[PDB]
Amino acid sequence: APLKLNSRNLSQIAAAGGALVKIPTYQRGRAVKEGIVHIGVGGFHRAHLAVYIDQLMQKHGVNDYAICGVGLQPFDSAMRDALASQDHLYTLIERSAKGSFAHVIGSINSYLFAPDNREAVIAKMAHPDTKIVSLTITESGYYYNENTHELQSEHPDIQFDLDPANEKAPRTTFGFLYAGLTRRYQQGLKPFTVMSCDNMQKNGSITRHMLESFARLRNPEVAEWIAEEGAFPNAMVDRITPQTSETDKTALAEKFGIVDSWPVVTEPFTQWVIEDQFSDGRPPFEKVGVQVVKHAVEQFEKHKLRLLNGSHSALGYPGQLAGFQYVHEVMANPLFRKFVWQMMQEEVKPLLPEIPGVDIDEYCNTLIERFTNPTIMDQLPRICLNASGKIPQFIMPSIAEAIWETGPFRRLCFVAAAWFHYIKGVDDRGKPFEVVDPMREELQAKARAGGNDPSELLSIKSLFGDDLRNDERFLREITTAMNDIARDGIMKTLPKYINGS
Numbered sequence: 399a400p401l402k403l404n405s406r407n408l409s410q411i412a413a414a415g416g417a418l419v420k421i422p423t424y425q426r427g428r429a430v431k432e433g434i435v436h437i438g439v440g441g442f443h444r445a446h447l448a449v450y451i452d453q454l455m456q457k458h459g460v461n462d463y464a465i466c467g468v469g470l471q472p473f474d475s476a477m478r479d480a481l482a483s484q485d486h487l488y489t490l491i492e493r494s495a496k497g498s499f500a501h502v503i504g505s506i507n508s509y510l511f512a513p514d515n516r517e518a519v520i521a522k523m524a525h526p527d528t529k530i531v532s533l534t535i536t537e538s539g540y541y542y543n544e545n546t547h548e549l550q551s552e553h554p555d556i557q558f559d560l561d562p563a564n565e566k567a568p569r570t571t572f573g574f575l576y577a578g579l580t581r582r583y584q585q586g587l588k589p590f591t592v593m594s595c596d597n598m599q600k601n602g603s604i605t606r607h608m609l610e611s612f613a614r615l616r617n618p619e620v621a622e623w624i625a626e627e628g629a630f631p632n633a634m635v636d637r638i639t640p641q642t643s644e645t646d647k648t649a650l651a652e653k654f655g656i657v658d659s660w661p662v663v664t665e666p667f668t669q670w671v672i673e674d675q676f677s678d679g680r681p682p683f684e685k686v687g688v689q690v691v692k693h694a695v696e697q698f699e700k701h702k703l704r705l706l707n708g709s710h711s712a713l714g715y716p717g718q719l720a721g722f723q724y725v726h727e728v729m730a731n732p733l734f735r736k737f738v739w740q741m742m743q744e745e746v747k748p749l750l751p752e753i754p755g756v757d758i759d760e761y762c763n764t765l766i767e768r769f770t771n772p773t774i775m776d777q778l779p780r781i782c783l784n785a786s787g788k789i790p791q792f793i794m795p796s797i798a799e800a801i802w803e804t805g806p807f808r809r810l811c812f813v814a815a816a817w818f819h820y821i822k823g824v825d826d827r828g829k830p831f832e833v834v835d836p837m838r839e840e841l842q843a844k845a846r847a848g849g850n851d852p853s854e855l856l857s858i859k860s861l862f863g864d865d866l867r868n869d870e871r872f873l874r875e876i877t878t879a880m881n882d883i884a885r886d887g888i889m890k891t892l893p894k895y896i897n898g899s
């Protein structure tokens with residue numbers, strides 16, 4: 399019978415699991431110190447950072463950097479319950495062409511749901527044991543005005559925390575960070591490093607400024623200590639981590655004998671480039687495959703955003719329009735493989751910085767492999783979700799750079815056009831599909847207004863810049879792609895964007 403994942407059952411689970419299951423054999427609980435407090439325990443934290451810590455704890459004698467999980471959003475209460483019932487153990491299900499593997503992760507040692515007791519969180523982040531506060535809080539959690547590079551202290555969530563009435567009971571990430579820091583300052587400790595693990599460009603610089611700004615509005619003698627003694631390292635983070643379904647959990651119990659309330663599903667690939675900027679110590683990340691660098695991070699990040707997330711966009715919107723269900727189905731198609739490879743090689747690669755010791759061609763081969771992975775079953779709707787937050791960061795910046803340098807960009811325009819068509823919510827066989835996007839109603843109105851001309855969608859100033867509305871080559875190119883996709887669909891149009899034979 400499948401066993402509930404907890405400490406009591408761990409050895410039975412590994413005994414019954416044999417070659418299919420790995421368990422942590424290091425000591426947990428009171429035996430370790432929680433040097434990392436992580437805000438926003440979701441899939442990617444538990445597939446990426448938590449796994450690196452797991453490996454440090456299992457193989458390298460690191461016992462002062464276990465993870466206290468912290469959830470600030472109302473949905474995080476479910477993570478508290480899942481982990482609590484399992485002694486904060488949880489299963490990482492790695493899916494690859496090689497099969498599936500259940501790696502039980504033990505690096506998460508405790509969990510605080512902040513709305514329960516907010517003082518316990520502050521006392522946690524202030525305790526000398528805490529050396530690093532890491533974040534996976536999504537773009538929206540940073541309260542970041544991208545265009546003015548400033549804290550959205552106009553946001554009522556910030557004002558609530560800025561209000562001295564809420565000093566002891568903050569709500570946002572920065573309210574908890576500041577509340578923890580001032581105690582450390584008053585006690586004479588160092589600032590903990592704040593280690594953003596979200597996928598945005600220069601995530602460390604943003605976090606520095608947000609917490610710096612918030613601090614300047616409440617006490618500049620602490621903001622000054624944050625700005626001088628704090629650390630906010632930039633990082634490139636990479637590991638594809640879909641959401642877990644009830645079917646994933648059933649398959650886990652039947653195939654590996656493990657009853658897990660919230661296992662995590664991921665690919666075997668992982669990558670982490672972080673700059674060596676830490677204010678109160680760090681474990682030796684480089685012993686478990688982490689690239690610790692000194693500018694270098696920004697180049698790795700641009701490689702990832704433009705070729706990985708860009709190619710995801712190339713697979714997602716055209717894949718959905720063509721009738722596919724999963725990433726690997728799209729990538730298996732010969733036309734898509736040629737289209738995606740040539741887009742990477744001919745259109746994105748010339749825009750990227752050369753990183754010493756990195757071969758971009760080899761990185762493209764590896765992305766193709768990863769996308770090809772048929773076991774991970776990555777649903778196209780997940781890739782395509784909230785496209786108005788994705789196309790302008792993964793695809794449009796390459797189009798804009800190709801405008802400024804007059805570079806080739808037909809395939810990039812095809813992807814942009816395919817999303818402009820995706821907005822109407824009807825695939826090439828005439829079947830509706832759900833469009834999920836915070837801007838759906840404005841996007842669908844302008845798309846219906848524009849027909850097959852792109853100018854109505856392009857008129858959305860919050861999404862697209864002047865360079866796009868005013869480049870004649872771009873206007874003609876994306877017009878051709880939109881007309882052709884709208885008339886003939888994706889599969890019949892793709893041959894025209896694929897050279898060679």
Ligand SMILES: NC(=O)C1=CN([C@@H]2O[C@H](COP(=O)(O)OP(=O)(O)OC[C@H]3O[C@@H](n4cnc5c(N)ncnc54)[C@H](O)[C@@H]3O)[C@H](O)[C@H]2O)C=CC1
Binds near residue numbers: 441474535637
């Ligand atoms: N394949 C993947 O899932 C990848 C994810 N990432 C990064 O991880 C982050 C989240 O990814 P997932 O773990 O897959 O999503 P998730 O849905 O599993 O969890 C995200 C976490 O963010 C919290 N959160 C959301 N808004 C918040 C806010 N305003 N304040 C505090 N916490 C907030 C949630 O409660 C949750 O704990 C970023 O979205 C992404 O850049 C990076 C590489 C790939």
